[PDB]
């Protein structure tokens, strides 16, 4: 039941300096996992043919 | 006369942070011994 602190991308009210790994610790935009489809291939190859 | 030449120190961000910590523009002095 421990609550880690809130390192915000917007508010720095007491003007602190936070290390980059703690600053860019937004996991959700790193696990977004840009994944492609397989029907791009059929389209591109058919257009070249 | 100003010389352009590649340096040796190559000042970094943590050096700026360390030299910024010692400015002390918010530490008020203690009250005098009254």
């Amino acid at each position: 039941w421990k609550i880690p602190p809130c390192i915000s991308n917007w508010k720095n009210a007491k003007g602190y300096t936070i290390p980059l790994d703690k600053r860019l610790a937004a996991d959700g935009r790193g696990l977004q996992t840009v994944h492609i489809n397989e029907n791009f291939a059929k389209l591109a190859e058919a257009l070249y043919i | 006369v100003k010389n352009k030449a590649p340096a040796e120190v190559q000042i970094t961000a943590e050096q700026l942070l360390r030299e910024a910590k010692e400015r002390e523009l918010e530490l008020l002095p203690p009250p005098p011994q009254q």
Binding site: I3, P4, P5, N9, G28, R29 | -
Partner: protein, 111 residues
């Protein structure tokens, strides 16, 4: 006992949202908790609302799932309030009804 008239509405909503979250985290913590740590969960909720408005996917790496679920619940509630207010003011701006200039700028910014 001042009335929530027109310029107190968003401040009163965000005043009451914090209070509901405070009551829920005082009821949600188990029996042997130090009864601190309310301000941090409130900051996590404000940051989760900012990440909803920015369309940034919000995930805290270590966080208890009741706190995370409750924050997602109240962020969805504030999302609903925000969006229904935007729909209402857009219909008013379209029909030509009496609207403020600030609500026109706020509504453009929401849309």
């Amino acid at each position: 006992a001042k009335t929530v008239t027109k310029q107190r509405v968003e401040s009163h909503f965000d005043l009451e949202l914090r209070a509901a979250v405070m009551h829920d985290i005082l009821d949600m913590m188990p029996e042997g908790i130090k009864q601190n740590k309310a301000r941090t969960i409130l900051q996590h909720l404000s940051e989760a609302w900012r990440c909803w408005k920015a369309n940034i996917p919000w995930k805290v790496p270590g966080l208890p799932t009741p706190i995370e679920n409750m924050i997602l619940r109240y962020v969805k509630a504030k999302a609903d309030w925000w969006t229904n207010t935007a729909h209402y003011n857009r219909e008013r701006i379209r029909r030509g009804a009496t609207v403020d200039k600030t609500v026109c700028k706020k509504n453009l910014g929401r849309l």
